Symmetry: D2
Subunit: 326 residues, 4 copies
């Protein structure tokens, strides 16, 4: 719009929706936590850890995970908009104190890729928000199909910090201006290319691939249609790879394999949110046998296979799947 900033944009979307402001507050809270995480990821205050004032305290990765988790939980609970939270970092669902209870359920991965931090890989934060439809709040309120998402997004802490957000009317991209302290709208209603020229998976699991994955990858490298082989990219940090898929097209895959027969990536707070973003941008996201968003979750840390991206590429993959299962 003319709204420029994420704060004004979200407020205005909430006015158009005729919201009571409960979701707008939840979204403000999440975005504030994301700003705080960006600052920490970029290492503001590092000199103090290394003894600049005479005090040396040097698991850094574990600390940043705890801090990022603590930022998101405290910001969300203090919004007065939540009843249940599921975090990648916590074994059990976290039930909001009765005094601060609202309507919404949030599933999130506060710092995805933090294992990679030591090599300074792009990392990110992923979230999905549901309405508690349902008696007293419990983990069951977080076990809703991805079709029920009200809002979802991710933050990528890369060369710059970016947020992808959808509330159901397409995908909008915002970049953090650190001099201002605000996210700025840079692309409205982003759409993925119908077909790409990049494929993204860990080919070190080639020995463990099903026949479908083997066939598909072989055709990316050795096409049978006279075209140039696809380029390969795999950062190993899910948000970086998914975001590149969104902006450049192509396909990203973490399929089941012999060692991970149900996949690796987590349904509630990795795969559902990114599937929603990708579908909202005109792409496809599949387990290989059904849309990610149609999977009925059985457990809050359930794993699923994930294949997503440009619709023509995901279709070509699904073709290999059907053919090799027949």
């Amino acid at each position: 719009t003319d709204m420029l900033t994420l704060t004004r944009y979200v407020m205005e979307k909430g006015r158009q929706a005729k919201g009571t402001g409960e979701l707008t507050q939840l979204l403000n809270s999440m975005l504030t936590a994301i700003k705080a995480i960006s600052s920490a990821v970029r290492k503001a205050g590092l000199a103090h850890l290394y003894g600049i004032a005479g005090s040396v305290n040097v698991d850094q990765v574990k600390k940043l995970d705890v801090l990022s988790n603590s930022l998101v939980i405290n910001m969300l609970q203090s919004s007065y908009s939540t009843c249940v939270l599921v975090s990648e970092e916590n074994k059990d669902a976290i039930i909001t104190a009765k005094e601060k209870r609202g309507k919404y359920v949030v599933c999130f991965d506060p710092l995805d890729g933090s294992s990679n931090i030591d090599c300074l890989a792009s990392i990110g934060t992923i979230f999905a928000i549901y309405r508690k439809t349902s008696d007293e709040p419990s983990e069951k309120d977080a076990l809703q199909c991805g079709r029920n998402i009200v809002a979802a997004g991710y933050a990528l802490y890369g060369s710059a910090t970016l947020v992808a957000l959808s509330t159901g009317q397409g995908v909008d991209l915002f970049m953090l201006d650190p001099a201002l302290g605000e996210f700025v709208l840079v692309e409205k209603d982003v759409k993925i290319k119908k077909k790409g020229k990049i494929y993204s998976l860990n080919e070190g699991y080639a020995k463990y691939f099903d026949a479908a994955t083997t066939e598909y990858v072989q055709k990316k490298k050795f096409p049978e249609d006279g075209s140039a082989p696809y380029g390969a990219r795999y950062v190993g940090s899910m948000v970086a790879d998914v975001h590149r898929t969104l902006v450049y097209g192509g396909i990203f895959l973490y399929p089941a394999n012999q060692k991970s027969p149900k996949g690796k990536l987590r349904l509630l707070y990795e795969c559902n949110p990114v599937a929603y973003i990708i579908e909202q941008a005109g792409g496809l996201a599949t387990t290989g046998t059904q849309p990610v968003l149609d999977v009925k979750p059985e457990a809050i840390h359930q794993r699923v296979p994930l294949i997503l991206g440009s619709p023509e590429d995901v279709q070509e993959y699904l073709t290999c799947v059907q053919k090799n299962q027949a």
Copy 2:
């Protein structure tokens, strides 16, 4: 040391070397340009481009390349330490005005990976410094073998901003604390693992690989020794992939292939600097037929094949090479 900051560390290394301060000034200048580039890469002032004060000006990639190039050139020339500069962004060598001429030659890539910027991939800045040994300065002073490097390094603008620097006594790592505006020493005398478990190349050129590359990659995925296959990673941004190789071990490759018979990566300002860092950290860097640092440059934008990393992995690759050439 106790030096804590890069500024004090470099000064003190220059006092121990008994330098006149000319190289210390050159290094201060480069690091200042790197700080300025980090700020721009992270998008400080973006809101002003998008019309916050009423003024909208929205090729952004080309601009950031020009700015990064302009930062490095002006900072280096104004140091009074340089006579010749070679930049990735300029066709010809840039000869320093006589009034500002010093002793050193600098080869640099001011913003490597900038093509990827739109997907927020990690990007970096790479440099190598030589002494003009040699009549009037010309591009010939930049055509020295990598064995003649006096200092070299890279900046990685990733989840945080980091500098790897060597002046010939090993590799030291520094992280930018943005709240302070200084680089902080985080690891002194870093050494690469003797053997890793990650291989990093673009397997989309598989159709174009020589027999050696094909054999090596097949053995990473299908080992013949009872071990687990290697993991694959390839960001497609050279500094990100090289830095991960340094900190985690393994191998990174951009070999010659049918479409790029001399390689893709540039000898003077990509491959020489990273080969020097990697060798200073106890690794190996080869063209496949000789050490990168022994290649005698013929032209300032010459390409070379590059294979580098943990010594046992690079040896295993060189074995495939020798065997398949025999």
Copy 3:
């Protein structure tokens, strides 16, 4: 209370007010302008001005353009008055909302060179009436819906009131958000600091002369008051709020109407100081009861702890004839 950030706090107050979001958006817009201004004032990007890649007037103009743009693009405004513009700015019809904003985008900027604390001051009115015009900005201060100031001092602070007291927020530049640091601040009943430019002593009226005399030479055995005068209105007004005492820029022979501007300096700070339980007077009338005649009108200003202002007013009334 739990809300922590100014964005959440303002939003929650709007929800409590049962607002449509129009004022909330306007406040969000102003606060974004203020963050942009703080960054420029602290000199972000200065190295680029000094040729790394090969003016007080410019910063005045930038700050003015920041505020005008953010406010117009809120869709919440119909009329703006700026210190920097001769005439009122009437918002394009497509972007029109119901609020009128009077502001000084960078107060104190003539003294930028000495790095003195400087600030941004604003007051918001609901338009009453009829096609928009200057007259819509000529409401008395009693009609203010919201007002506040940003001080760019050792840290950046905002003081804001929407009619329920004064709240103080500090910018955390690492987060890029204002954090609530004090709720419902109250000025001391009586302070121990007086603040005016005594370099105009030669031109003071008798009441002012008498009052300053009493501060330095008290007759009741109390310690004399300390003196402070930064010469930057927001810094002096803010110090008076937090420490107490009195701030004065009265009329003098050389400035017979006073110096400070009613619409976008005096009314806003008066509103804050009264919301905090202080007094704000021209020496004739409460500031907030002055009926404005012109958009750049000047008035005298005496404000602060109520007991100190009442003393001043006793001196004025006494010397009247």
Copy 4:
């Protein structure tokens, strides 16, 4: 001149001086402390203090620890005197170098609450002699090798002299480097602003009373001087440098030795103002000629444009008997 950044500028001056790098490292250490302090003063990380993840005394202590640590770890120092420490701090023998540094790490911090401009002040001496001790910090100001101040105002600025005039640098927080903004600054011969706390009028000596009278009521038909008093020494001293005039904290009946501290407030600013072509006096003696008796000794301070200080001194000499 071409050097742009303070780090390059200081390094180049050390190369011109044919230094071994010891002083350069010390300056680098101090400037790093100052950047760390500016960031804390602007309240980076405040949201974490207010519970986002679930004190003026603390900032005094942090600033003090920043400076002590950076200076000790330079390997350039043998003795430090801080405003914050009773006793001199003797550097561990392993880290000892030849310089003695007297500093106020956060001057003005008692008034942090009102967000007043505040600063950091330092002076550096070469040790003369013999095992290190307090006595090594009791050199007169004439022996200063380098001195300066950081002002944390609307922007962060450093004023530095190493004996060749005064240079001014501004922090670009986007780059994290100080940028040269003025070389070899010279104070005006005569200014138009006087700066003191006239709340002590009741306790002034006759010379001070007479002088202030002349500023407000000149007898030669000139306009009276304007008054400014921030109450923060670095802000008032810096304004006097850039705009001219006079700054006074003389002895009075209540503070008979004066208030400001010789080693780490008065000597450093005197050194800067004299290097800029101004005067700095106790009213008895130039500050820089005072032979210090004790590390926390107090002295009167009058400084600024030379023509204005000489007028003050004429008033002092005149009223002596």
